[PDB]
């Protein structure tokens, strides 16, 4: 059996495609074989995304793996919702219960609000980026209004790379009006390093302040530069490097060739790459469950036009989403178990605090506790 799937990747995702290659080589099976058709197109421009979707649908795929921007989520929830094609993603969780949307990143708002209620704050700043939606901003504003807090919430995403030195200077000059001490940084893996570098340039990392790196990749950024400053700075981690399987994957990861696999000659790994490596295992386990349930869904590359009027679905894909909700495995993000919608249940997020010798885990968080 040959199962043809589609895979979309943005221009610039080199480490995630390398982790996809490692997951495809490592999780090969005996009963069947996957065939990913890879499209390296832009993720923000929805026209190229729709072209890549219809080009993968013209090939007649059974599943589509790939990323999506916050600017084009309502496209992906539409075309995968009507045509009944499962879409597996390591990107941010959507706002709602969309069918055929299987997602790898757990909720960050609950752990972040739990960390604030553990630290017992009342007046803090919130520097957010406008590229992964505004769900976390609405969550912290709702819980701030419900818990009587004072949030100085500032967008930072509209600042260009040409003059990002005087804007940050005026930003942290305006943050000294009310004598703000505690700042939550909700940015991606690229903006956090620039903000930390400009804080270090203006000198606001001494003992007396606080920072929270609001993502799953707390060890992804360069933390050798605010380690000896040592205010408190904390964050969230999804990849526990002290496990056996994670340490084995790191020991098999750092030995790889940089020219053969770009972005693999690091001691650590980005969280999206780990979610991709887990999603390959999820798709392999679901296809193995269909190979073991004696269900023949084999066809050819004649799925038709994506803009068919009316585009009639094929019902055997409806079980395939019911395949993906029936997967409970163990990967780099710990336990992987899904709900009826497509979100993640029974997960674990470690709360890291950066000490002098390095980051040290102080506890874990789940949704049932």
């Amino acid at each position, epitope marked *: *059996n040959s199962i043809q799937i589609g895979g979309l990747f943005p221009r610039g995702a080199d480490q995630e495609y390398s982790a996809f290659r490692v997951g495809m*080589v490592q999780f*090969s099976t005996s009963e069947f074989r996957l065939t990913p058709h890879i499209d390296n197109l832009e993720v923000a421009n929805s026209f190229a995304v729709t072209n890549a979707f219809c080009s993968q649908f013209s090939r007649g795929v059974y599943a589509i793996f790939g990323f999506y921007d916050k600017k084009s989520v309502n496209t992906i929830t539409s075309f995968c919702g009507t045509l009944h094609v499962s879409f597996i993603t390591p990107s941010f969780p959507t706002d709602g219960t969309h069918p055929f949307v299987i997602q790898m990143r757990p909720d960050l708002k609950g752990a972040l609000l739990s960390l604030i209620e553990y630290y017992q704050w009342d007046k803090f700043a919130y520097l957010y980026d406008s590229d992964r939606g505004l769900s976390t901003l609405q969550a912290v504003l709702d819980s701030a209004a419900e818990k009587k807090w004072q949030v100085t919430a500032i967008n930072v995403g509209n600042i260009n790379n040409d003059k990002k030195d005087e804007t940050y200077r005026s930003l942290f000059q305006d943050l000294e009006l009310k004598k703000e001490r505690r700042v939550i940084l909700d940015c991606e893996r690229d903006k956090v390093n620039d903000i930390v570098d400009q804080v270090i340039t203006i000198g606001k990392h001494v003992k007396g302040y606080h920072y929270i790196i609001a993502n799953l990749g707390f060890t992804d950024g360069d933390l050798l530069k605010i380690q000896f400053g040592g205010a408190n700075v904390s964050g969230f981690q999804i990849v526990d490097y002290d496990d056996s399987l994670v340490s084995k994957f790191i020991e*098999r990861w750092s030995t790889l060739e940089e*020219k053969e696999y770009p972005g693999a000659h690091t001691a650590t790994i980005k969280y999206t790459s780990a979610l991709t490596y887990d999603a390959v295992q999820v798709m392999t386990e679901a296809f193995r469950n269909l190979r073991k349930q004696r269900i023949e869904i084999s066809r050819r*590359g004649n799925a038709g036009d994506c803009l068919a009027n009316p585009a009639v679905p094929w019902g055997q894909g409806v079980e395939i989403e019911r395949a993906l909700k029936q997967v409970q495995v163990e990967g780099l993000s710990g336990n992987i178990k899904f709900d009826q919608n497509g979100k993640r249940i029974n997960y674990t997020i470690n709360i890291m605090e950066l000490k002098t010798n390095g980051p040290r885990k102080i506890g874990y968080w789940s949704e049932v506790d």
Partner: antibody, heavy 119, light 108 residues
Framework: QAQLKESGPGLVAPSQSLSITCTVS????????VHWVRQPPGKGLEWLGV???????NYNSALMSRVSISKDNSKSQVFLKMNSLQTDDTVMYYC?????????????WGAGTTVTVSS | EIQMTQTTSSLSASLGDRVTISCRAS??????LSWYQQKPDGTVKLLIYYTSRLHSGVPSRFSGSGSGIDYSLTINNLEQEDFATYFC?????????FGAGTKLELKR
């Protein structure tokens, strides 16, 4: 660079065993797959089988009860056993490595050996 | 299963010619085919991956194209080391049936 060298007995009697040893270098055998393929002289090449890094092994549909593959990661060696050989087993054997570059492809192959099954 | 075939068994060319080698399949392979080279001593190397891309370590003189069931490899200029056996390998459905394999020859 990665290299592969196959070795065997060369001459064996009919309906007997045949052990081929493939040694790989320049890489590791704990994270890649090794595919063994036969080649008849003057005919088309046939895929004998393949073994994965996760202990998975697949064989051909017509001779599934005739070939076996094992590996030793300490010496980076692959041992291929073939029993119930016939007179048409005077062929060549090759071992190669598998990879994923948007398709399941063969990246680094070997020199291959010649096996002549005759009594 | 899917049977691959190549009608051209031997091609003759001189130094500096653009030689083409075609390959057909029994069904649509969705361009999931590779083109490999094999010297007469037994050494086998890879030349073109996924029917359009060039592998790291191969020169820029060779190229590949095609669609559907018809794939093709092209050499811009034949060299002395280019005299080998070019073979096509499909990788869509198990078992991975390879091509027939053509052998380049020097024209004199």
């Amino acid at each position: 660079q990665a290299q592969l060298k196959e070795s065997g007995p060369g001459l064996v009697a009919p309906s007997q065993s045949l052990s081929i040893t493939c040694t790989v270098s320049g890489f590791s055998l704990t994270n890649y797959g090794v595919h063994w393929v036969r080649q008849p002289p003057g005919k088309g090449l046939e895929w004998l089988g393949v073994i994965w890094a996760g202990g998975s092994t697949n064989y051909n549909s017509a001779l599934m009860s005739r070939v076996s593959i094992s590996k030793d990661n300490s010496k980076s060696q692959v041992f291929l056993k073939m029993n119930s050989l016939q007179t048409d087993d005077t062929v060549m054997y090759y071992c190669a490595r598998e990879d994923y570059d948007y398709d399941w492809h063969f990246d680094v192959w070997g020199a291959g050996t010649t096996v002549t099954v005759s009594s | 299963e899917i049977q691959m075939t190549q009608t051209t068994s031997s091609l003759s060319a001189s130094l500096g010619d653009r030689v083409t080698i075609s390959c057909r399949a029994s069904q649509d392979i969705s361009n999931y085919l590779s083109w490999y080279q094999q010297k007469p001593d037994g050494t086998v190397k890879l030349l073109i991956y996924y029917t359009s891309r060039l592998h790291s370590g191969v020169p820029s003189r060779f190229s590949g194209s095609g669609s559907g069931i018809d794939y093709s490899l092209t050499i811009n200029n034949l060299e002395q080391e280019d005299f080998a056996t070019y073979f096509c390998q499909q990788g869509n459905t198990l078992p991975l049936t390879f091509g027939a394999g053509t052998k380049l020859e020097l024209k004199r």
